[PDB]
Amino acid sequence: SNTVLPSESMKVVAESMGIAQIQEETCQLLTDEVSYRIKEIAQDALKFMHMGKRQKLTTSDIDYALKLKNVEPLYGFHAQEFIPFRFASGGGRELYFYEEKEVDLSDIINTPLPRVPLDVCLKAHWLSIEGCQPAIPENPPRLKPRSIHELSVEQQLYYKEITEACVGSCEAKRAEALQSIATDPGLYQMLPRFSTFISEGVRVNVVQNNLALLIYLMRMVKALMDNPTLYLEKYVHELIPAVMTCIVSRQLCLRPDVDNHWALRDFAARLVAQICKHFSTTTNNIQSRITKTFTKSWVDEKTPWTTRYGSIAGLAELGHDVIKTLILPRLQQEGERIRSVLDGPVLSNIDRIGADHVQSLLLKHCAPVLAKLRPPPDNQDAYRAEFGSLGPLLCSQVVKARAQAALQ
């Protein structure tokens, strides 16, 4: 068809200029002339798009198409003397339909300056090696015979090198192997052997609580997850009980020396578990199942305090609403547990350390619950209704959070 601009827009323009009482044939005469000039320019701006080898366009093809037709490029002002603004364009007007029509010079100064990129360079790579396209990141994607393994010997040697580097004898070797896991596109069809190596490892690595072996395996899990190419939820049924035990298990090695790393190991395990509950989600299978196991870990009476601390951390990192509903009716039990560890003279065991870590974590989570959906007031002795665990020091932490909010 031949679509033109509407004539009922051309009469609005005419009567808002001082030219009243225009006929319909006078008004139809305006809207076939200007609709041709839009069609003449958009067909002529198409030349610059096809010779600019882009199709997408950069605000500027109409500026050269106008200059080609001996019409000045700038829109919104027309100079009848032509000399300060010749056929050089001013880049158009950054205007919107949903704009405010109100602007402040001070507000523009207040806005932070954006970042300017490094200048264009020239990198070379390989599309084809003697006919075959490589999988580099610059590329898009009755005696019978004996069978062969579905991995190549380069792939099997790669698996052996990556697994012997990921057990962390040297740190630079680990870090590359972790980046190699994080971005190898062909790491599918090797993924059963990686999942089995992880799963089997943690289970025979908690027989003796070897923390590095576990911290390296959790980093291997995290490096497996952020790889975008591979399909993981076929293997998550092996991945999730491995991270579960890491968080909810007792430490066979001495607790005091590597408790900070044990908390970090639980922290790595909770972070992967929360990412696991964020991805791979269908109705009522994964997130609710680990939530139920965490709550019956909490509810069970007279727990190991390592298991208690790990389950507390796992319950806490589940997001905004989960602590808004699951960390409310239980403060009295937490306080009673802290009071029992406090009473009595035996501190040799790990119970006291577990109690201090659990109380600190629970108190910080309470702070956003107090900040997110409550108003601060009576920060001196009202917390004694919650067994008086953090009290005024908790109030001081809330005040520091308020100061950080003011700085923001």
Partner: peptide, 25 residues
């Protein structure tokens, strides 16, 4: 709808806690 592919992915059909030995004999 219970024949949807996800129902059969072993993340939605496997108990991680149960699989681990957890020092139990």
């Amino acid at each position: 709808d219970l024949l949807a592919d996800e129902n059969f992915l072993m993340v939605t059909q496997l108990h991680w806690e149960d699989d681990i030995i957890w020092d139990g004999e």
